[PDB]
Amino acid sequence: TTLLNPYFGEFGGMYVPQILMPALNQLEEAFVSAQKDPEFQAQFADLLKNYAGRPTALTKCQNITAGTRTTLYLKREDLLHGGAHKTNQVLGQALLAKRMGKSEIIAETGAGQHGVASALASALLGLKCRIYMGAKDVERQSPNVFRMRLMGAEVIPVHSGSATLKDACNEALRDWSGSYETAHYMLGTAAGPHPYPTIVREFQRMIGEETKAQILDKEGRLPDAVIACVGGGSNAIGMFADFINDTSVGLIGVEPGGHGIETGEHGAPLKHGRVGIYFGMKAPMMQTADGQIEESYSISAGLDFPSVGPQHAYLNSIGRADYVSITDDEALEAFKTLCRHEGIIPALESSHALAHALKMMREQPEKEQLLVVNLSGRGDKDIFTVHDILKARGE
Amino acid sequence: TTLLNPYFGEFGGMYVPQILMPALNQLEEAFVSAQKDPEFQAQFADLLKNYAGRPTALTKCQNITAGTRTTLYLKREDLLHGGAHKTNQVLGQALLAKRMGKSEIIAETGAGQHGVASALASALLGLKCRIYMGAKDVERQSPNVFRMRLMGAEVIPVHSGSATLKDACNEALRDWSGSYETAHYMLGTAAGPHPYPTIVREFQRMIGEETKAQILDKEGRLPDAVIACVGGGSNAIGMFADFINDTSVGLIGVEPGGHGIETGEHGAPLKHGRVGIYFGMKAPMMQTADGQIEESYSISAGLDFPSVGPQHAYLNSIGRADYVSITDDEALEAFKTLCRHEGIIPALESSHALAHALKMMREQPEKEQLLVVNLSGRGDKDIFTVHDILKARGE
Amino acid sequence: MERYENLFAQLNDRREGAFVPFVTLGDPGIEQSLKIIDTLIDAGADALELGVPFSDPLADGPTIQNANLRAFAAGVTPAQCFEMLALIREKHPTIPIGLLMYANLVFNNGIDAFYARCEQVGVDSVLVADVPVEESAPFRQAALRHNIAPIFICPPNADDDLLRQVASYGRGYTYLLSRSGVTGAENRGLHHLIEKLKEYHAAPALQGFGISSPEQVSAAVRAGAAGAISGSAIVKIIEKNLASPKQMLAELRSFVSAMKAASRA
Amino acid sequence: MERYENLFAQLNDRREGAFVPFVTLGDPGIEQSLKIIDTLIDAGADALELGVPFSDPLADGPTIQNANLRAFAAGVTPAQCFEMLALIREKHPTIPIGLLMYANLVFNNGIDAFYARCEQVGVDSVLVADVPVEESAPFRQAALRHNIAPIFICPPNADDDLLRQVASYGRGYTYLLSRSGVTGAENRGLHHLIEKLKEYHAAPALQGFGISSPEQVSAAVRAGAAGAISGSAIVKIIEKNLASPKQMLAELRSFVSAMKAASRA
Ligand SMILES: O=P(O)(O)OCCNS(=O)(=O)c1ccc(OC(F)(F)F)cc1
Ligand SMILES: O=P(O)(O)OCCNS(=O)(=O)c1ccc(OC(F)(F)F)cc1
Ligand SMILES: C=C(/N=C/c1c(COP(=O)(O)O)cnc(C)c1O)C(=O)O
Ligand SMILES: C=C(/N=C/c1c(COP(=O)(O)O)cnc(C)c1O)C(=O)O
Ligand SMILES: [N+]
Ligand SMILES: [N+]
């Protein structure tokens, strides 16, 4: 029994060991109560404004659309405290944790932005924070490891499986199944068991709300499409949510194509996997013929995940949102292009969304279109990775 | 002959080779014209808002003042695009450069934040950017070297002298003296020859303007003091300017004490040097008995400078502002404390200002005082430096 | 069939609790796994709980994680597991056999087909570890359709509604969780639950998680549980003796015999 | 005194331009520097421009930067420079001696005292490189008070007001900058300026920056300049021959003699 629907069509649910169901029901109740509590909403709003820096800018690109009929705006979640959108919903979940009498926080992280967010919120609000991170990601997103530890978080490298995000997720959940009495699992994406896909959407939906207000102010109309990268799905559902009932607005989610879908080395289960049950949810996943979960791949740690949040699988199924993929090389070119022509260094995750917008423009340059890309994070964490690549290519 | 006063009392002036005086007079004229041009002001305002992310938050500390009668706010220039206050005036000077028909930009940088700002503004506004950086700073602020180069700026290591900020300043000025016909020298601090101390103040003064509005909104009164670190002087004069005529508001500038003033290894010429002529200005400097310019020292590259902007020397002389120093170890403790108790990683420069505020609180914990620290930048550039130190100490 | 029903009735007569070892099918290889299982049975195992190797076993600690990894290193697939199960049942007609499954392996190519396969090889029960009673409808329906007992979990934090559901939906045995957390002999882990389950006519309770010693087996029986499950303690003996397959079986026999002896009241 | 006035009058009679070498005092050491300077004079130098080593010489390129560094490595101080200047004047009573100074070295312990010291050792002029005419009042006042010629710069971008100021405020000679930028033989660098300076009765013009060859000296004279200054070209000969002090002086003599020969019309 739940207060809210755990499913989005066929997708979602609460596929966790029985031991964790009371924790999930407690969290759901706490969320529903908080959502109608004016004091909770005021505290959350105050942190978002005065601590995190909301609202974030909506930046019109000045150069990269030259000679085309595309107008491109960037929603600047890269300017949020911590450097990514992940900070929004962590502030909300941390307040929920306090509301529920929890003193510790467990989090998983891939790009380390959710890890950084979990650590900074725990430091601010007086919680003891431990973060699981795949050992491969500890290396390729190292600046965030340093940032997490300087803020007093325990960072635990995960060497099992692919040593990336799915393996951090596994260990976080294993931990919680034993520590839920005192620890809140601050899941960092719009995936996992109910109520997390719902909570994460509601605590990220100010992205799209602000975007709508800002684009109406600057252009006097809604966008033709909003475009966001999709790992687990939080920045995209945060951008999409307030536009779902605006049927004229395209919702475009961009999964990582890795080395190419045909290589099998990608992270695009929504469009190239099939439905399975894993990480507490029924959702599209990369899996073997036998039903073993496949390891994903992306140049971007934040998108290196073999499943996807259930609300995206649903929005796809009914045709409300469209999902595409972008390869490592396409993302790298978008990264370089934004750096050199707009003076913004984007996260490699966000670069996948930008790459697809650039394709929409370049493929049809006389098509009139007003586009918004969710620039979900800044690229400081990626600069050493990207430089090393742009040295094995000359450059 | 000039349009504006080049002096602040005894301090300031235009002590450059004769060859550069027309360039300085041209720049002054361009600035005076721009300051009364509604279109220039609108373009500058639009970039500050929609590209850089102004206004920046004013954050009340929740934990680090516990048990005392100090209320401490942080002006969050760390949330500005690029990660430091340096971005504000670079956007203004870049617009000035365009106004004057220049196609290239020269800049010096120590912490690399002005370098990053110069590079991002040049990429946005279509200018060719070269940046001088001391070789010691190339190493200890390496993340910003990567950021500058990814945005298409040429970064030129300077090995002469101390291989730090003063040596980058020297080379930038040497370059400009030959290239002024096509290059604008985008000086990054409130120092150097007139009109730069004036221009930099006016293009940074929104820091204090916003702070005043924000503190009035939240507290219904002006601060008892505003506190800012002082290298060349730009973030401090930017915070101070709008409060200069509010005589009840203390203005406290914090120079780097390095290993201790008594060691001679510091960057605190305002209070521990004597007046000299160098880098185009008459100002306090660290100098030998003979009048050779001394090399400075600070753990912070951005404060590692043996002089100070002339308006600070003036405000000190008349007693309007007070200047103090903070050692490496005091700055490191403030850095750690902000990370762990407020979840904000500050620049080591900014940590000097925070350290002094913490001293004001700790020394007199039952003194009622409302303080603002200018958190001039974020500490991502410093995390590898700080970690290496906090390993040679155990930790 | 009625293999659990027949087992518990016989144990009841003999004044005995059940001792039920867990191992991963195909750990450390198919042939050695089959020998291990025969040894477990010869040494006194009353029933078996057998894991099908899964890529991401979220209810298992490192010991059984590494058992899964060993089986995969031997190339073990669910198809090969079902071949093993058929062979085991061919040898041992009455011992109850329960599978430990993760949901995706059951769901993968059809829930109904999975339980149909279980029936064909002579499996008696299936415990799907990451399917709570709330999500269990298509699993328990398919299970009952193919004469498989669906197993459900009574955690220490169980409320009355869960107790009533577990008692109603479950067959064969009720899993009485010793503690929160994941499987592991390192972490050692209630009469009010045992009594309430009996009141609601639930399938007999087997206590599991953290049971690694004969004293814990005796204590579970004394508490009113119908028996005890031990996994990691068994698997550690396999892990310890990989280079010594002969000592592996000797030490397994000694341990299982000791655990079974403690179930006797 | 009137050493520049006397020099230019004599050169005028002989139909000659002045050739004026620059070196850094104390480069590569005090004793060798004194020998270098005697060699410059014996080889035909009409006047001298001499740099006092300064920590941050912002109008100088790498060649003279490294001359300053060499002198500092020899421990050369302004005090030692003034001792050198006294010795030079003792040996050579009529040759005009001009100093190349940076402002802080003049300002350091009193502008008036600096120019008083110059007078005591027999210096004839001081060029403060980073003090434009706009900032020059206390410098030129102190200079004239102590019978020192203050030297000012006529850049290629000079307007009429600058020309009139330079003509009025300056004594001894007028510095005619060949080009923008900083000192350097690598970078080679106007009649309208030369003519206007003469119209306003300015001190005779010496062209400087980038002059490294006899052809450039001849060309400056042909243009109507009273002579030419060469620094980096001279200093490169010092730098090249550090391990060979004897060849250093021979090559200096050859070069200075060739440059001076080209000044003769
Ligand atoms: O002795 P231990 O600690 O290794 O425990 C062995 C248990 N092996 S098992 O198949 O019964 C078993 C039973 C239930 C499990 O998860 C669930 F409770 F969530 F369903 C996992 C394994
Ligand atoms: O031959 P080069 O290129 O080395 O030039 C040598 C010049 N040496 S100097 O003392 O006359 C000299 C004269 C003026 C200088 O700067 C100023 F113009 F700004 F004042 C610097 C050096
Ligand atoms: C995996 C992580 N980050 C993902 C991420 C993503 C992808 O995650 P979502 O699909 O949940 O937005 C997008 N943009 C940025 C800047 C990100 O850091 C993490 O920081 O833990
Ligand atoms: C030297 C540099 N930075 C100085 C700096 C300073 C000191 O410079 P001002 O005194 O001009 O503010 C303060 N805070 C931050 C974040 C800084 O980066 C530079 O980025 O070039
Ligand atoms: N995905
Ligand atoms: N300073």
PDB file of C-alpha atoms in Angstrom, chain D residues 56-229:
ATOM      1  CA  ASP D  56      62.156  44.841 -12.661  1.00  0.00           C
ATOM      2  CA  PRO D  57      63.254  46.761 -15.780  1.00  0.00           C
ATOM      3  CA  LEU D  58      59.914  47.165 -17.591  1.00  0.00           C
ATOM      4  CA  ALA D  59      61.250  48.984 -20.660  1.00  0.00           C
ATOM      5  CA  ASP D  60      63.878  46.324 -21.408  1.00  0.00           C
ATOM      6  CA  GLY D  61      63.801  43.125 -23.424  1.00  0.00           C
ATOM      7  CA  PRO D  62      65.535  39.859 -22.504  1.00  0.00           C
ATOM      8  CA  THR D  63      69.059  40.892 -23.575  1.00  0.00           C
ATOM      9  CA  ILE D  64      69.280  43.811 -21.140  1.00  0.00           C
ATOM     10  CA  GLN D  65      67.139  41.967 -18.614  1.00  0.00           C
ATOM     11  CA  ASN D  66      69.934  39.403 -18.483  1.00  0.00           C
ATOM     12  CA  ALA D  67      72.581  42.132 -18.218  1.00  0.00           C
ATOM     13  CA  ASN D  68      70.816  43.354 -15.076  1.00  0.00           C
ATOM     14  CA  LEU D  69      70.695  39.781 -13.752  1.00  0.00           C
ATOM     15  CA  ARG D  70      74.421  39.315 -14.380  1.00  0.00           C
ATOM     16  CA  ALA D  71      75.249  42.460 -12.454  1.00  0.00           C
ATOM     17  CA  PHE D  72      73.078  41.359  -9.548  1.00  0.00           C
ATOM     18  CA  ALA D  73      74.816  37.970  -9.586  1.00  0.00           C
ATOM     19  CA  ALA D  74      78.049  39.943  -9.104  1.00  0.00           C
ATOM     20  CA  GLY D  75      76.385  41.716  -6.172  1.00  0.00           C
ATOM     21  CA  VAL D  76      76.201  45.099  -7.898  1.00  0.00           C
ATOM     22  CA  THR D  77      74.265  47.780  -5.985  1.00  0.00           C
ATOM     23  CA  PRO D  78      73.391  51.390  -6.859  1.00  0.00           C
ATOM     24  CA  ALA D  79      76.037  52.440  -4.297  1.00  0.00           C
ATOM     25  CA  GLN D  80      78.675  50.474  -6.174  1.00  0.00           C
ATOM     26  CA  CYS D  81      77.438  51.991  -9.442  1.00  0.00           C
ATOM     27  CA  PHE D  82      78.036  55.487  -8.122  1.00  0.00           C
ATOM     28  CA  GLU D  83      81.556  54.476  -7.109  1.00  0.00           C
ATOM     29  CA  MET D  84      82.083  53.242 -10.694  1.00  0.00           C
ATOM     30  CA  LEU D  85      80.724  56.442 -12.167  1.00  0.00           C
ATOM     31  CA  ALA D  86      83.133  58.515 -10.045  1.00  0.00           C
ATOM     32  CA  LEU D  87      86.057  56.428 -11.325  1.00  0.00           C
ATOM     33  CA  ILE D  88      84.880  56.747 -14.932  1.00  0.00           C
ATOM     34  CA  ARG D  89      84.596  60.530 -14.694  1.00  0.00           C
ATOM     35  CA  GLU D  90      88.024  60.693 -13.016  1.00  0.00           C
ATOM     36  CA  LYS D  91      89.497  59.064 -16.124  1.00  0.00           C
ATOM     37  CA  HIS D  92      87.406  60.830 -18.737  1.00  0.00           C
ATOM     38  CA  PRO D  93      86.685  64.485 -18.016  1.00  0.00           C
ATOM     39  CA  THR D  94      84.650  65.568 -21.041  1.00  0.00           C
ATOM     40  CA  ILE D  95      82.616  62.604 -22.271  1.00  0.00           C
ATOM     41  CA  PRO D  96      78.913  63.022 -21.542  1.00  0.00           C
ATOM     42  CA  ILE D  97      77.576  60.372 -19.203  1.00  0.00           C
ATOM     43  CA  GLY D  98      73.881  59.618 -19.064  1.00  0.00           C
ATOM     44  CA  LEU D  99      72.156  57.205 -16.714  1.00  0.00           C
ATOM     45  CA  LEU D 100      69.242  54.950 -17.556  1.00  0.00           C
ATOM     46  CA  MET D 101      67.154  54.790 -14.391  1.00  0.00           C
ATOM     47  CA  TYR D 102      63.894  53.311 -13.312  1.00  0.00           C
ATOM     48  CA  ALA D 103      61.752  55.532 -11.152  1.00  0.00           C
ATOM     49  CA  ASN D 104      61.923  53.607  -7.895  1.00  0.00           C
ATOM     50  CA  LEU D 105      65.722  53.815  -7.800  1.00  0.00           C
ATOM     51  CA  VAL D 106      65.510  57.604  -8.103  1.00  0.00           C
ATOM     52  CA  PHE D 107      62.550  57.966  -5.741  1.00  0.00           C
ATOM     53  CA  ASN D 108      63.784  55.442  -3.141  1.00  0.00           C
ATOM     54  CA  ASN D 109      65.614  57.540  -0.606  1.00  0.00           C
ATOM     55  CA  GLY D 110      64.708  60.931  -1.982  1.00  0.00           C
ATOM     56  CA  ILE D 111      64.581  62.340  -5.490  1.00  0.00           C
ATOM     57  CA  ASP D 112      66.637  65.382  -4.577  1.00  0.00           C
ATOM     58  CA  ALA D 113      69.337  63.246  -2.948  1.00  0.00           C
ATOM     59  CA  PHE D 114      69.554  61.034  -6.031  1.00  0.00           C
ATOM     60  CA  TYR D 115      70.263  63.918  -8.379  1.00  0.00           C
ATOM     61  CA  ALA D 116      72.653  65.419  -5.821  1.00  0.00           C
ATOM     62  CA  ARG D 117      74.601  62.146  -5.914  1.00  0.00           C
ATOM     63  CA  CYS D 118      74.643  62.241  -9.732  1.00  0.00           C
ATOM     64  CA  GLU D 119      76.138  65.727  -9.623  1.00  0.00           C
ATOM     65  CA  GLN D 120      78.798  64.655  -7.106  1.00  0.00           C
ATOM     66  CA  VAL D 121      80.115  61.869  -9.329  1.00  0.00           C
ATOM     67  CA  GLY D 122      79.936  63.958 -12.513  1.00  0.00           C
ATOM     68  CA  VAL D 123      76.928  62.492 -14.309  1.00  0.00           C
ATOM     69  CA  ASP D 124      75.498  64.749 -17.025  1.00  0.00           C
ATOM     70  CA  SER D 125      72.010  63.390 -17.634  1.00  0.00           C
ATOM     71  CA  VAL D 126      69.361  61.093 -16.229  1.00  0.00           C
ATOM     72  CA  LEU D 127      66.659  59.339 -18.221  1.00  0.00           C
ATOM     73  CA  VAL D 128      63.940  57.907 -15.997  1.00  0.00           C
ATOM     74  CA  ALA D 129      62.283  55.329 -18.242  1.00  0.00           C
ATOM     75  CA  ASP D 130      58.933  54.944 -16.498  1.00  0.00           C
ATOM     76  CA  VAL D 131      58.321  58.645 -15.739  1.00  0.00           C
ATOM     77  CA  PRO D 132      56.439  60.342 -18.574  1.00  0.00           C
ATOM     78  CA  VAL D 133      56.471  64.142 -18.906  1.00  0.00           C
ATOM     79  CA  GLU D 134      53.078  64.189 -17.189  1.00  0.00           C
ATOM     80  CA  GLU D 135      54.664  62.872 -13.957  1.00  0.00           C
ATOM     81  CA  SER D 136      58.040  64.525 -14.352  1.00  0.00           C
ATOM     82  CA  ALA D 137      57.848  67.736 -12.266  1.00  0.00           C
ATOM     83  CA  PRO D 138      59.779  66.713  -9.130  1.00  0.00           C
ATOM     84  CA  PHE D 139      62.334  64.801 -11.228  1.00  0.00           C
ATOM     85  CA  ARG D 140      63.157  67.576 -13.671  1.00  0.00           C
ATOM     86  CA  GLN D 141      63.156  70.173 -10.881  1.00  0.00           C
ATOM     87  CA  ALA D 142      65.673  68.154  -8.857  1.00  0.00           C
ATOM     88  CA  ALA D 143      67.708  67.484 -11.986  1.00  0.00           C
ATOM     89  CA  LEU D 144      68.030  71.159 -12.908  1.00  0.00           C
ATOM     90  CA  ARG D 145      68.772  72.055  -9.266  1.00  0.00           C
ATOM     91  CA  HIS D 146      71.836  69.835  -9.385  1.00  0.00           C
ATOM     92  CA  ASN D 147      72.968  70.650 -12.930  1.00  0.00           C
ATOM     93  CA  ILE D 148      71.736  67.376 -14.358  1.00  0.00           C
ATOM     94  CA  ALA D 149      69.983  67.233 -17.729  1.00  0.00           C
ATOM     95  CA  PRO D 150      66.644  65.465 -17.469  1.00  0.00           C
ATOM     96  CA  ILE D 151      66.071  63.369 -20.618  1.00  0.00           C
ATOM     97  CA  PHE D 152      62.644  62.898 -22.150  1.00  0.00           C
ATOM     98  CA  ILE D 153      61.225  60.634 -24.800  1.00  0.00           C
ATOM     99  CA  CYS D 154      59.754  61.524 -28.166  1.00  0.00           C
ATOM    100  CA  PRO D 155      57.851  58.388 -29.238  1.00  0.00           C
ATOM    101  CA  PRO D 156      56.708  57.788 -32.834  1.00  0.00           C
ATOM    102  CA  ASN D 157      53.131  58.426 -31.621  1.00  0.00           C
ATOM    103  CA  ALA D 158      54.006  61.891 -30.273  1.00  0.00           C
ATOM    104  CA  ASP D 159      51.484  64.692 -30.728  1.00  0.00           C
ATOM    105  CA  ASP D 160      52.192  68.407 -30.809  1.00  0.00           C
ATOM    106  CA  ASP D 161      51.662  68.994 -27.079  1.00  0.00           C
ATOM    107  CA  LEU D 162      54.170  66.265 -26.209  1.00  0.00           C
ATOM    108  CA  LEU D 163      56.691  67.686 -28.691  1.00  0.00           C
ATOM    109  CA  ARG D 164      56.393  71.134 -27.107  1.00  0.00           C
ATOM    110  CA  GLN D 165      56.736  69.709 -23.592  1.00  0.00           C
ATOM    111  CA  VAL D 166      59.722  67.537 -24.455  1.00  0.00           C
ATOM    112  CA  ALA D 167      61.390  70.502 -26.141  1.00  0.00           C
ATOM    113  CA  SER D 168      60.788  72.721 -23.101  1.00  0.00           C
ATOM    114  CA  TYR D 169      61.437  70.332 -20.198  1.00  0.00           C
ATOM    115  CA  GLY D 170      64.382  68.375 -21.577  1.00  0.00           C
ATOM    116  CA  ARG D 171      68.089  69.228 -21.610  1.00  0.00           C
ATOM    117  CA  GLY D 172      71.239  67.628 -23.030  1.00  0.00           C
ATOM    118  CA  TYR D 173      69.611  65.484 -25.708  1.00  0.00           C
ATOM    119  CA  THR D 174      66.126  64.392 -26.810  1.00  0.00           C
ATOM    120  CA  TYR D 175      65.482  60.659 -26.993  1.00  0.00           C
ATOM    121  CA  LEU D 176      63.958  59.766 -30.347  1.00  0.00           C
ATOM    122  CA  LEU D 177      62.328  56.374 -29.955  1.00  0.00           C
ATOM    123  CA  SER D 178      62.733  54.227 -33.108  1.00  0.00           C
ATOM    124  CA  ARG D 179      59.673  52.141 -32.345  1.00  0.00           C
ATOM    125  CA  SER D 180      57.186  50.973 -29.760  1.00  0.00           C
ATOM    126  CA  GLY D 181      58.031  47.990 -27.600  1.00  0.00           C
ATOM    127  CA  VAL D 182      61.028  47.366 -25.361  1.00  0.00           C
ATOM    128  CA  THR D 183      64.802  47.373 -25.919  1.00  0.00           C
ATOM    129  CA  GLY D 184      66.138  44.658 -28.211  1.00  0.00           C
ATOM    130  CA  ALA D 185      68.459  44.252 -31.190  1.00  0.00           C
ATOM    131  CA  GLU D 186      66.087  41.645 -32.633  1.00  0.00           C
ATOM    132  CA  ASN D 187      63.413  44.275 -33.277  1.00  0.00           C
ATOM    133  CA  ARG D 188      64.508  46.983 -35.723  1.00  0.00           C
ATOM    134  CA  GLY D 189      62.654  50.294 -35.846  1.00  0.00           C
ATOM    135  CA  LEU D 190      60.812  60.030 -38.554  1.00  0.00           C
ATOM    136  CA  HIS D 191      61.683  63.342 -40.209  1.00  0.00           C
ATOM    137  CA  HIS D 192      58.473  65.087 -39.181  1.00  0.00           C
ATOM    138  CA  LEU D 193      59.406  64.538 -35.534  1.00  0.00           C
ATOM    139  CA  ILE D 194      63.057  65.514 -36.065  1.00  0.00           C
ATOM    140  CA  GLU D 195      61.988  68.694 -37.880  1.00  0.00           C
ATOM    141  CA  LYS D 196      59.379  69.668 -35.271  1.00  0.00           C
ATOM    142  CA  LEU D 197      61.863  69.146 -32.434  1.00  0.00           C
ATOM    143  CA  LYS D 198      64.293  71.508 -34.150  1.00  0.00           C
ATOM    144  CA  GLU D 199      61.508  74.050 -34.695  1.00  0.00           C
ATOM    145  CA  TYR D 200      60.781  74.040 -30.963  1.00  0.00           C
ATOM    146  CA  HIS D 201      64.505  74.308 -30.143  1.00  0.00           C
ATOM    147  CA  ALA D 202      64.664  70.939 -28.405  1.00  0.00           C
ATOM    148  CA  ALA D 203      67.939  69.393 -27.315  1.00  0.00           C
ATOM    149  CA  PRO D 204      69.583  67.454 -30.190  1.00  0.00           C
ATOM    150  CA  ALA D 205      67.935  64.116 -30.957  1.00  0.00           C
ATOM    151  CA  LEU D 206      69.565  60.728 -30.408  1.00  0.00           C
ATOM    152  CA  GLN D 207      67.712  57.810 -31.980  1.00  0.00           C
ATOM    153  CA  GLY D 208      67.420  54.670 -29.869  1.00  0.00           C
ATOM    154  CA  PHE D 209      65.875  51.141 -29.699  1.00  0.00           C
ATOM    155  CA  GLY D 210      66.764  48.381 -32.163  1.00  0.00           C
ATOM    156  CA  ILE D 211      69.896  50.026 -33.570  1.00  0.00           C
ATOM    157  CA  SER D 212      72.426  47.231 -34.080  1.00  0.00           C
ATOM    158  CA  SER D 213      74.189  47.974 -37.352  1.00  0.00           C
ATOM    159  CA  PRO D 214      76.306  50.745 -38.919  1.00  0.00           C
ATOM    160  CA  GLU D 215      73.736  51.217 -41.693  1.00  0.00           C
ATOM    161  CA  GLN D 216      71.103  52.193 -39.105  1.00  0.00           C
ATOM    162  CA  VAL D 217      73.518  54.705 -37.582  1.00  0.00           C
ATOM    163  CA  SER D 218      74.232  56.287 -40.978  1.00  0.00           C
ATOM    164  CA  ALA D 219      70.506  56.361 -41.749  1.00  0.00           C
ATOM    165  CA  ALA D 220      69.704  58.124 -38.464  1.00  0.00           C
ATOM    166  CA  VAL D 221      72.280  60.809 -39.223  1.00  0.00           C
ATOM    167  CA  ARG D 222      70.981  61.203 -42.789  1.00  0.00           C
ATOM    168  CA  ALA D 223      67.509  61.682 -41.297  1.00  0.00           C
ATOM    169  CA  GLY D 224      68.715  64.675 -39.292  1.00  0.00           C
ATOM    170  CA  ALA D 225      69.180  63.064 -35.890  1.00  0.00           C
ATOM    171  CA  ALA D 226      72.272  64.176 -33.977  1.00  0.00           C
ATOM    172  CA  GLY D 227      73.196  60.556 -33.352  1.00  0.00           C
ATOM    173  CA  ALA D 228      72.234  57.049 -32.323  1.00  0.00           C
ATOM    174  CA  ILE D 229      72.186  54.819 -29.250  1.00  0.00           C
TER     175      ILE D 229
END
